[PDB]
Amino acid sequence: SQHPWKAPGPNDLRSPCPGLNTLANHGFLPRNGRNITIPMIVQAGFDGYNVQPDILILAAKVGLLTSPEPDTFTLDDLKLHGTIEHDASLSREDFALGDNLHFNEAIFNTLANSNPGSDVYNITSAGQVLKDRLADSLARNPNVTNTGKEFTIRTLESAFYLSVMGNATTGEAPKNFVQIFFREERLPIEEGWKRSTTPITSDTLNPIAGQISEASNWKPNPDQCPWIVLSPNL
Amino acid sequence: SQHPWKAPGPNDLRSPCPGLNTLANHGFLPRNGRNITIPMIVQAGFDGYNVQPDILILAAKVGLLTSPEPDTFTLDDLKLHGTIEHDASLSREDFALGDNLHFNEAIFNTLANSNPGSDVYNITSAGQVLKDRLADSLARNPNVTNTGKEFTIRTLESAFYLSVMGNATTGEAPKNFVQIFFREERLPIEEGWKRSTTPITSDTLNPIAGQISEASNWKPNPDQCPWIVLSPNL
Ligand code: HEM
Ligand code: HEM
Ligand SMILES: *[C@@H]1O[C@H](CO)[C@@H](O[C@@H]2O[C@H](CO)[C@@H](O)[C@H](O)[C@H]2NC(C)=O)[C@H](O)[C@H]1NC(C)=O
Ligand SMILES: *[C@@H]1O[C@H](CO)[C@@H](O[C@@H]2O[C@H](CO)[C@@H](O)[C@H](O)[C@H]2NC(C)=O)[C@H](O)[C@H]1NC(C)=O
Ligand SMILES: *[C@@H]1O[C@H](CO)[C@@H](O)[C@H](O)[C@H]1NC(C)=O
Ligand SMILES: *[C@@H]1O[C@H](CO)[C@@H](O)[C@H](O)[C@H]1NC(C)=O
Ligand SMILES: [Mg+2]
Ligand SMILES: [Mg+2]
């Protein structure tokens, strides 16, 4: 109740990440999306979601590469293509095709309509979505980057939405909570969402991501070396 | 005079980097080599050497990957092979062959004896040293990693010793200052070394590194993708 949802205003920077954006929209991260340090990310992920430090620390260290500042980033910086941001997102367009930053319903339609006839999204549907989103990028984006780096991140992001909106042990999440999370970047509190009472860790997320990977029918582009883009000055 | 040299004691952690180690040995960085943040690196490089932030910030952000902590590293963490630490060092052995952390005179002999008959090391001699050190690694290390990432770093490190011990405009450095720097990880103050009165920046270092690269007779291993090792837990 000390962390109400408020829509970002024009000064309030946001990322391509529903996880961080929802934390900002509740004031777990700064509402203005600016001046974010690694400890702020670690604290916010714990307080909002019961996500534990190891995975947040690595992501946040990589995220600092997107920023010219010594030890902060803004949420907008994290759009930098090829650092973390990648093609075949669940809810954003590819950088070469359109807007890699903002929620897009037409892209999200695939995830929205997944697991038809169930009340949850689960590992199986999440892998089908990864398969279909990458096939779309390969069909329409001549510049798609699809290495083990991007695929690993995509499996972890799908494990994240299942775990933070759902059950972090089983990887099942109520569809309506996932929809609100992406579309509104809001914690669905009035709708009955509760913060996980089990810690969400690398040991809970990695097995879910691995099972999603096995359900994705994936292969890498064989000619592309994985890379983390190291600065936005290129 | 408020930054005297003191040898590290057993609790005082050090890196594979003469630049950072010399800063610690003078107390510009903590003498114990522990609890180092990005702003500490930026401040220490400015105060000791007149090195400016951009290049320090990127290096320090990458250095955080070597540490399990949220926003610090120790100097010892920076030994992690394949993050920054690389084969064909000027003064350390390759990880697969021996000690990748401590100064080794037998390795340093090549740099020491370079530019025979001159009172300086310069771009030409620095490129000859890169050539000979990589040839040694290729001859003796079956596991050598030699991509554009490592070669770029090696050219910048050589530009660094020339610039901080010498003239940051020309890339010429008095031999005796460079020798003390590596062998003692000390600023050669009694010997006449003065901090650069011109700022050392990416715009001064990059042209030196580029000329060193052109004098190195380099080629990459064609089968190796450049990579930054992302954690020491692997
Ligand atoms: C706190 C827990 C987090 C959760 C639950 C979370 C969740 C997600 C999800 C589900 C996506 C995929 C969005 C899509 O494909 O449309 C995503 C993307 C992203 N996240 Fe996170 N995230 C979290 C933390 C972080 C952190 C710590 C960073 C970096 C500091 C980060 C940076 C990103 C970026 C840059 C993307 C865009 C990747 C892309 O789709 O192209 N996230 N996140
Ligand atoms: C402050 C200015 C700096 C100078 C003058 C400097 C100088 C050097 C030099 C000359 C080497 C090569 C040593 C050798 O090959 O034997 C080196 C290596 C290294 N430096 Fe720096 N450095 C500086 C800053 C940094 C920073 C900011 C980091 C990271 C936080 C860093 C991390 C390293 C590492 C890990 C190595 C080992 C690479 C290797 O030889 O395998 N240095 N440095
Ligand atoms: C994800 O949810 C789907 C839908 O409920 C599961 O697929 C069903 O599995 C049951 C039991 O095997 C079958 O009787 C149904 O016919 C399946 N339905 C459809 C529509 O495919 C799927 O098993 C779930 N995945 C996981 C990992 O729990
Ligand atoms: C680095 O120093 C060497 C040694 O002084 C320079 O090579 C000399 O260059 C002069 C002028 O061209 C010649 O007369 C000498 O015979 C060269 N000496 C040797 C021993 O090679 C070299 O030019 C310098 N490099 C740079 C970039 O300044
Ligand atoms: C999550 O699923 C696990 C495994 O089935 C179950 O034991 C636990 O009760 C579930 N969590 C909640 C809050 O229902
Ligand atoms: C460094 O070299 C430049 C270019 O020759 C010269 O102008 C400058 O005086 C030198 N610096 C010092 C401190 O001698
Ligand atoms: Mg994307
Ligand atoms: Mg080395």
Residue numbers in the entry:
A (entry chain A), B (entry chain A): 8 to 241
Pull verbatim passages from the article behind this deposition.
Unspecific peroxygenases (UPOs) are a class of heme‐thiolate oxygenases from fungi that have similar catalytic scope to P450s, but are dependent only upon hydrogen peroxide (H2O2) as the external oxidant. A recent survey by Faiza and co‐workers explored the diversity of UPOs within sequence databases and was able to identify two major groups of enzymes: ‘long’ UPOs (Group I), typified by AaeUPO, of approximately 45 kDa molecular weight, and ‘short’ UPOs (Group II), typified by the enzyme from Marasmius rotula (MroUPO), which are of approximately 29 kDa. In this study, we have cloned the gene encoding an ‘artificial’ short UPO (artUPO) close in sequence to MroUPO, and expressed it in both Pichia pastoris and E. coli. In addition to their overall similarities in fold, artUPO, MroUPO and HspUPO feature both a glutamic acid and histidine residue (E164 and H93 in artUPO) that forms the catalytic acid‐base pair, in common with CPO and in contrast to the Glu‐Arg dyad found in AaeUPO.
We first crystallized artUPOyeast and determined the structure of the enzyme in two forms: the first in space group P212121, to a resolution of 2.01 Å and the second in C2221, to 1.21 Å, with two and one molecules in the asymmetric unit, respectively. The side chain amine of K156 H‐bonds with the backbone carbonyl groups of G89 and T90 in artUPOyeast, and may also confer extra stability to the enzyme.
